[PDB]
Amino acid sequence: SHMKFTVEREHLLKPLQQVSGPLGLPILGNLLLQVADGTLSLTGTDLEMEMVARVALVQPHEPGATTVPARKFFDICRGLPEGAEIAVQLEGERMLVRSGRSRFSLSTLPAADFPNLDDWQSEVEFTLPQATMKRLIEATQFSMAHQDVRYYLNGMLFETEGEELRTVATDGHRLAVCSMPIGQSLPSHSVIVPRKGVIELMRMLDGGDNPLRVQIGSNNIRAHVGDFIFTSKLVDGRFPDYRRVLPKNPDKHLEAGCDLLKQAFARAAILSNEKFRGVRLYVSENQLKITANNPEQEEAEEILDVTYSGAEMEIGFNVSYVLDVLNALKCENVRMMLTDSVSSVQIEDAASQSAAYVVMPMRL
Amino acid sequence: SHMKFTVEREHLLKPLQQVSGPLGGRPTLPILGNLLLQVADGTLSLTGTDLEMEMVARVALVQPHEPGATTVPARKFFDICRGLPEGAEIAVQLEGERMLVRSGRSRFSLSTLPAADFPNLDDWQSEVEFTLPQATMKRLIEATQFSMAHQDVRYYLNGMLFETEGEELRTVATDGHRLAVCSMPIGQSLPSHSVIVPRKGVIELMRMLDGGDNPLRVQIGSNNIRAHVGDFIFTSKLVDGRFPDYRRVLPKNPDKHLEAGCDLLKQAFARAAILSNEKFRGVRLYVSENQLKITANNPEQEEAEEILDVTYSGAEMEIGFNVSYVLDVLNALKCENVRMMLTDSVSSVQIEDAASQSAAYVVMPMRL
Amino acid sequence: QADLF
Amino acid sequence: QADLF
């Protein structure tokens, strides 16, 4: 009932920044602080997900719990000098923060009022490097839908198969798929992580050598990184099957430099229609021609030297979808695998098949 | 009427970014979204305007060209040039009512508006002329710019006073609650002159200064100011009103002197600000022997208290301030020690660098 | 824009 | 806030 602790500022700053992620209702604007047997626990939630940080307490402390405004508490700690010792204690309904001759009295809400996610059971468990999880999310995140009526598209599929972890994201117009080996045999499982949960998980990965431990339940996912524990509810519904979305036999193969292709599309985009973003591609022997026009009759034309020996064809695309893919492919060369004017295109790194991108054309 | 030029991308990029400075707001008149391009005897001139000011860049043309003029959409033209590869040669020509931009096997056809329709500021005559280092002009603007008003009904406050006196150039900015004044020696005897530069013009002028060794040449007329920096020429209309007199705003005899570290004072005010009222931003200062106490409270009854060791021997007093006005001053004073010169609870405070009197800041208190 | 699925 | 002038 009389919570009290003293911690160095530098052991409090990163945990405060992290747990504040789900934030952006009163109690929802607060962090739950809990002192128990050598541990200070800090929790932030938005009801769909929660972020927890554990800080070891090496100085005398008294057990207890309270909730305090997240932004004000973080700004106070951040604003104190490097190396400051922060003494915190509950005094009635107020939380006191003292360091040097600086005194702050913050308002509180009862710890008993802080919302918790329901108790659940882990079905799947595996550990992987942080960098692998970052690569998986970064390779596909841009392809997620935002606010689509098909709820299951406003998120990302997390799929375990064999020894691989795979991410799939799609909005019904374009799709991104990436898979990585994680050196351990896994059961076959697929879950949809909500888009805000994907963003929170990304932000918790510093790319450091602290490994990431994942636990998957029927209705939840949980990620443990160092002293942090992230938990999110999952999205319901039948996610599309990338195996059926990948073009069956894309016989027309084009190869070109990733940067040269990206820069040509980015310049052509300037004179594309602001609403429809349509660009027209003309493939001929060792040549790609990109054209864009807008309602003012302004026009952009780019001619590129490429590797191409197939039949001549014309195909239209939303240039933002093409640029998104090229921006995600941080490689030297790109391969574009075409079928016809009315069929999707598959785009990938010419040197790696770990990620694949599928874009549906436009009827120009 | 067949304008044509070929220029290297790297000779076009900084001039395009610069002349585009005055463009951006609610684009009412369509041609204000365009840059005027003019080719004449080895020079490409590019002009951007918002009607109150204009920015001009001159690019030497080392390749064959044909004279003429047109206006082209600024953002689209800049994005095209910036998007082309490093070292690209840009060939531009007028073709009917379209402007063509070609480089490698990239072709862009932009819409135009007649050069004859581009607005020009009326012809005027220079009364005052002086040159100064860019770094001096930057220091003058940066020391006071934050104290200008935004949208005040006293339109002369939504700008900055530029004043020449003796051998100095001075800037003054005030919003009716706080005032900033800075003056620097120019090393030239100058006539006494005072003009108000519009706030958008102050910011633009500020933007054109790269602090570089290219000197700044200023020309002042009755209704205009003009600044020449390297290949750029900035011109603005002036604000026609009666600017307040800083000499009468500075506290007459601020007898209570307080001295403290600038960073320690700034960090204590910045932490106290967290628990201040979000709308009113009020902080309470209590000065006593070698001590400053800063307190802030908000409607939730949350409270911040900071106690600092300072140099102070005067009478004890309490005084309230908007903490953002105090922090603005401390942030502008990029020095080790500060001096706050106080009178009483209802009177303005003067703040300055304890080691330099080149800039002075005056803040009116809040009723506690 | 054509639908992918 | 008090007025400066």
Side-chain angles (χ1 to χ4, degrees), chain A residues 69 72 75-76 79-81 94 101-107 263 267-268 270-271 274 287 294 296-303 305, chain B residues 73 75-76 79-80 83-85 98 105-111 267 271-272 274-275 278 291 298 300-307:
Chain A
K72 281 166 184 171
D75 288 353
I76 286 163
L80 285 160
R94 297 295 157 158
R101 291 184 75 119
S102 309
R103 178 190 188 275
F104 306 89
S105 179
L106 295 168
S107 66
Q263 297 326 328
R267 288 190 298 269
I270 300 159
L271 300 185
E274 298 187 25
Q287 192 182 94
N294 62 20
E296 302 107 281
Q297 310 300 85
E298 284 171 337
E299 188 194 345
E301 183 184 286
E302 291 287 341
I303 302 166
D305 283 349
Chain B
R75 181 46 59 100
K76 279 165 188 171
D79 289 354
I80 286 163
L84 286 159
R98 297 296 158 157
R105 289 189 82 187
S106 310
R107 177 191 189 276
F108 307 84
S109 178
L110 296 169
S111 66
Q267 296 327 326
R271 288 190 296 271
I274 300 160
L275 301 184
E278 297 176 357
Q291 190 175 279
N298 62 19
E300 303 107 281
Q301 309 302 317
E302 284 171 338
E303 187 203 304
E305 181 186 286
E306 289 289 342
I307 304 168

